[PDB]
Amino acid sequence: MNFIKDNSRALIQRMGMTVIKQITDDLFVWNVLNREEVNIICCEKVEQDAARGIIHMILKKGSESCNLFLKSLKEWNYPLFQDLN
Amino acid sequence: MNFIKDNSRALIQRMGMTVIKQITDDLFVWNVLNREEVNIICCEKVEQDAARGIIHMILKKGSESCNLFLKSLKEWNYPLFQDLN
Amino acid sequence: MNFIKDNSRALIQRMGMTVIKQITDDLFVWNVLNREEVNIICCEKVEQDAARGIIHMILKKGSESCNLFLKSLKEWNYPLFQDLN
Amino acid sequence: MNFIKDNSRALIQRMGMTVIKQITDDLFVWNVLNREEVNIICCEKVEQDAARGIIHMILKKGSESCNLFLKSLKEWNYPLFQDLN
Amino acid sequence: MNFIKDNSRALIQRMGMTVIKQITDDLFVWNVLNREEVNIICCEKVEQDAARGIIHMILKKGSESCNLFLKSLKEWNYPLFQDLN
Amino acid sequence: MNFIKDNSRALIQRMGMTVIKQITDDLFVWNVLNREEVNIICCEKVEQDAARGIIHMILKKGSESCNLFLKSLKEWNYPLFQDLN
Amino acid sequence: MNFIKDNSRALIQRMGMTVIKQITDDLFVWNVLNREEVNIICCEKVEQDAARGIIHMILKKGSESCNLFLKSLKEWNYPLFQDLN
Amino acid sequence: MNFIKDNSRALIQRMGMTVIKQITDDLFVWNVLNREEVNIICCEKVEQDAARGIIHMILKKGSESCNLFLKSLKEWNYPLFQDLN
Amino acid sequence: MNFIKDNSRALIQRMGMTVIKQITDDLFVWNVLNREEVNIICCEKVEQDAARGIIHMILKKGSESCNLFLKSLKEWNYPLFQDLN
Amino acid sequence: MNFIKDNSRALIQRMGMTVIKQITDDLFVWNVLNREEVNIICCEKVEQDAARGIIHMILKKGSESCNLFLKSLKEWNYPLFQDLN
Amino acid sequence: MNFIKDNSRALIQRMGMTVIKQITDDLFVWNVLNREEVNIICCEKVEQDAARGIIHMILKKGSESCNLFLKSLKEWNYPLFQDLN
Amino acid sequence: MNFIKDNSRALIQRMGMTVIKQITDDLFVWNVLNREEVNIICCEKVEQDAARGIIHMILKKGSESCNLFLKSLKEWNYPLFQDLN
């Protein structure tokens, strides 16, 4: 998805860890990620690094995994998604 | 197997180390690889190089070792395998 | 011991760090490991990597070091050992 | 660009990793670098080595890629760029 | 092809190994090179020597193999190809 | 032995250096080779050349030295030996 | 065979050593050459000299040995053989 | 010493780097090795290669240097030495 | 200094990282080390490796740099220095 | 310069890679070395070999290039230069 | 040209291979040398021998080919050319 | 000197390259060898060949050059020299 690439400069800045901890779960429910990638992402200290791991690990998993991330991104932390349009 | 050769341009890009660490184990269980090749593959830094070592070391071990790699590739990181068809 | 090899696919998944921190000590008491290997294993972040280091470092120390690991594995975290049979 | 060459003695000293992690992203957005060079640069330990890789990999990519690096260097870590003139 | 010959003074200087590792793959997919030439080229240390081996091994394989190299050179490391015109 | 000659086209292709490093040792234990031939074989870069040196240096040492090579070849890297029959 | 004679001006130029190392093997399997001629050809430095020795040593061994050389030349380094027609 | 030669098949497999890092020091104290050989051995990645360098560099330094290696081998990693008898 | 060499077997074991972090600073104040060596030593995980880097980097800087290290070693972590005599 | 020749026995021993990485840069700024010699020197593993390459490549570039090396050697790692007088 | 003859005692000593690898290329661009002479010169081990081949093969190719060699010698490795006047 | 001749059977076996790299330097300091012989000896792969070149090149340079070689042989790698008496 181009929408993630073009705004990934701002996505690694104003996202927040507290919403990452939820997006990773909603992704784990839909059988996109296994447990090891959650244990690797969720253990980092600075949330910007987790943003790097998630953004870089979703652009690798085709384009169908982008839509799920976008819905799970507009459910939690909606003001950012509405602000970015 | 032709399926690996024809898609090996994309397999060395969107694979990921975290799933390689499991594929190498599932291969080690079935007596395909010995320990030294695991110690050689698992010590590299960039995951693309590990993808090169695995892809280049499976095309050498006949064609029966391809099917096991394909099963262990469709168990972990299924969205890539489903996307590639 | 074959019992570790045949189930090492599941041992690197459902083990847990909190029991590794005890198994390493019970091994350190019986003069199997020295301190440097404990400092190397206990400093890793993801517990699966510690499981890899322990499982790969016990299959190297003969077969007598397997029984001690099995006893220290059935004392703490007994439901896993009972479930695996 | 001569400005980078003449001050590259000081650019590999007072730069810092935390700003490199942003410069690499702002470069990745503008289709200058691909992902593999980011995975190679961002994995090094000492920030001076990352400064060597970036400075040596930009002087090779013509002169138009120097101006973008200079803008992305004057946005983040402005006091260094203002101090160097 | 004359375009490679006339600019091969600059192609062995500002190319980089990280893009060679991809060009060799995209060439290996199209049945141009076999595995042994990849094992000979990819094992050299200084990237300039790999540039010598590739540039000297493509001018020998007719002119039809030049176009594929040029496309695979404008996909990865595009700023160099655009700068060289 | 005819079995080595008739399949030596495929033995110099799908063998691998990592198993050569063990076969040379298992040969060195049984007083077949001295150290200088190990220092000559183990220093080459491309594994195919080491395959040439070993295959060409065993057909010279009678036929009794073939059986040891075959056993040491079916212990490590068994899938190749089983595939070749 | 006239096809080798008429194009031997270009065969001693764009052939390459890396394919000679395979053609000599595929010839040695079919009991065409003995080992001493392989030890004579494979020890030369410039690949053009090996091309001279091989091309001059095949035109002497009748015409039936030309067809095998042509097949082994169209298996490895096919783009040259297809380009030369 | 024959004891090292006859069991060097197993010594290059189940030794481990973590004990090599200590054996090299205990050897460096007794003026057996100088610093350059320590810098050559300690920089390798796979521990099996370090085992090769140490085992091959001790069989060259007479037989008196074997006893020190055996004592320093039975102090650290004692279960291996006791298992090997 | 001979005192460091003769006890370097025990200095790389019972030293500790928490005192290394202070010795490196007290050395940096007296213009013995520059910043890059501090960034190289302080980034290692196991404290024994830092002990190796410091002990091996002081025996290279003459003998006058030994006395400062000994004073800075008897200020912090005094019981070890008093125990070693 | 005689001062380098007469002390080159000790300069290839107690120098260190960490200061070589800076001397090569300060030399690269003053248009003494080009990039290829830096890529050749900086890629070696053991620092003693880099000391050999630098010391042997400076005694070839006249005597005016010795003074610059001496200044850049007395700026970083001053205690060695002061100890050697 | 007399300038090469009178100083060829010093040109075969302080030149270096790393600059020869570039001078041969800059000569190959201007249609002075063909590929076979580059394959003959570039394959020698000691750089002094390459200096002998180049210096002896340029004094044979008239005097117009000397000026190009002098320019390509003053572009790379300038301190030698400036020192020799 | 007879001592070198009578033990040169064992000197070409248990010497090692790592000490040759120092003996050649200590010889170069005392104006015994020039640089070209160092470039000839130090470029060989198998250390036994370097032992052949050094041992055969010292028996030619009178007998006074033997004592220097013997001292430089008893400084580095002392256990061999003490074992050989």
Residue numbers in the entry:
A (entry chain E), B (entry chain D), C (entry chain K), D (entry chain A), E (entry chain B), F (entry chain H), ...: 1 to 85
Published text:
Many NLR proteins nucleate the “inflammasome”—a large macromolecular complex that triggers inflammatory cell death and cytokine secretion in response to microbial or danger-associated ligands. Like many other supramolecular assemblies in the human innate immune system, the inflammasome complex relies on homotypic and heterotypic interactions between the death domains (DDs) to initiate, amplify, and propagate pyroptotic signaling. Inflammasome sensor NLRs can be grouped into two categories based on their DDs: PYRIN domain (PYD) and caspase activation and recruitment domain (CARD), both domains were found to form filamentous complexes to initiate the inflammasome formation. Extending this analysis, we also found that specific type II interface motifs directly dictate the compatibility of heterotypic pairwise CARD-CARD interactions among NLRP1, CARD8, NLRC4, ASC, and CASP1.
To extend these results beyond NLRP1 and CARD8 and test the predictive power of our model, we examined a third CARD-containing NLR sensor, NLRC4. To unambiguously assign the Type II interface residues of human NLRC4-CARD, we determined its filament structure at 3.3 Å using cryo-EM. The final polished structure closely agrees with previously published findings. Interestingly, unlike NLRP1-CARD and CARD8-CARD, the strong density bridge in the Type II interface is absent within NLRC4-CARD filaments. The Type IIb tyrosine residue (Tyr78) is folded backward toward the hydrophobic core and does not participate in intermolecular Type II interaction. Instead, two nearby small residues, Asn77 and Gln82, come forward to form a class of Type II junction that is more flexible than that of NLRP1 and CARD8. Molecular docking predicted that NLRC4 Type IIb surface would be structurally compatible with both ASC-CARD and CASP1-CARD. This was validated using the in vitro EMSA assay (lanes 6–7 in both panels) and in 293 T cells. Overexpressed NLRC4-CARD nucleated the formation of both ASC-GFP and CASP1 C285G-GFP specks, as well as ASC-CARD-GFP and CASP1-CARD-GFP filaments at similar levels. The versatility of human NLRC4-CARD is in agreement with previous studies on murine Nlrc4.
